[PDB]
């Protein structure tokens, strides 16, 4: 299915590169301007994604936990294509969503909304300290020092159970110098 994922990625790349209203390429402009001020994210209004090609929105809303990382990947590739002269390094870009889907009040959310994109509102009653989550883990086997890696999308991974070619039962460890991390924060919404 990697060809299918590649076609999802290329579909999103085409959405960034082609979406235009009133003579302005709004997402090319926004992505470039975001790169200049060195915030590596893109704010996408899903009204525009629906208006471009609703098949993409249908894929996104059917399973966002698989589709959102592909959209993020597409944003990285376009970011490089519009800010670096290739044949003469940026992180994984965050996707940010704007929406006007009808709100589900916080009490009505239940088991039928699991893994759906949801829009809600409330009062933030607490905001935890920042915490570090891994995006890229550099990984080493404790016995043979076979090295590998895990590239992580934070939408829901673990260390491998045994060595990927005796080598011990549960052998892998993290190389904390080469591994890449991101800020994560917890909020409570009432």
């Amino acid at each position: 299915n990697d060809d299918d994922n590649t076609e999802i990625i290329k579909s999103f790349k085409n959405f960034i590169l082609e979406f235009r209203l009133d003579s302005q390429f709004i997402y090319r402009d926004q992505l470039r301007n975001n790169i200049l001020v060195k915030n590596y994210s893109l704010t996408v209004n899903m009204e525009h994604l629906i208006g471009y090609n609703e098949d993409i929105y249908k894929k996104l809303s059917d399973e966002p936990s698989d589709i959102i990382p592909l959209f993020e990947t597409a944003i990285t590739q376009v970011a490089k294509r519009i800010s670096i002269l290739s044949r003469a390094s940026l992180p994984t870009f965050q996707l940010i969503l704007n929406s006007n889907a009808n709100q589900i009040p916080l009490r009505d959310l239940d088991s039928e909304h699991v893994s759906k994109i949801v829009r809600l509102s409330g009062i933030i009653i607490s905001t935890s300290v920042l915490s570090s989550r891994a995006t890229y883990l550099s990984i080493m086997c404790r016995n043979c020092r076979h090295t590998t890696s895990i590239t992580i999308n934070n939408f829901n991974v673990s260390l491998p159970r045994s060595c990927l070619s005796n080598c011990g039962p549960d052998p892998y460890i993290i190389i904390h110098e080469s591994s890449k991390f991101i800020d994560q924060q917890f909020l409570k919404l009432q």
């Binding site: 082609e18 390429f25 002269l85 290739s86 044949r87």
Partner: protein
Amino acid sequence: SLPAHLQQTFSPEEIQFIVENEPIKIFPRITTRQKIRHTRWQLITTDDKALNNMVAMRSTEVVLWIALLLKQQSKCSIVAPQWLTTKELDRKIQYEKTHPDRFSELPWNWLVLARILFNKAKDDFHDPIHELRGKIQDLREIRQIKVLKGLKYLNESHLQLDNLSLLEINELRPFITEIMDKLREIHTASLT
């Protein structure tokens, strides 16, 4: 007597006004060449002769503001210049990607004229206009990368920018001139 924002630069409308003085090729949809077998254009800034001798769909060359005036009505079509076709813009894009330092030799008015004609003559292009807009955007983005590289090499001495557009220059002008002026004033002040 001159506003602050016009003191040492041109407004983009003045850049447009400059570009509108360029000749452009049109297909007339009126005939003004009276046969041998009435009001004449009688201009004082530009070539009166071409407009008095138009014949419908014999292509001819006139100043761009007159072509826009005739294209505000249905009385001509503006022939997009040869560089603005898809294949030529793609060649310029390949040049830009192949030479990381040089700017490609697009004409000085390229962004201004692309904007003007994509708005006022969107129907006259042989190629699909969304591709022309896409490739003009590709060129502006790639050229902006090259500009941002070039500004790392600002001097107290001078600078060279071979094929940078009138609009791109006019957009950069206050920044570049002010920064190079201050670098000069730092350097000259240090002299005995």
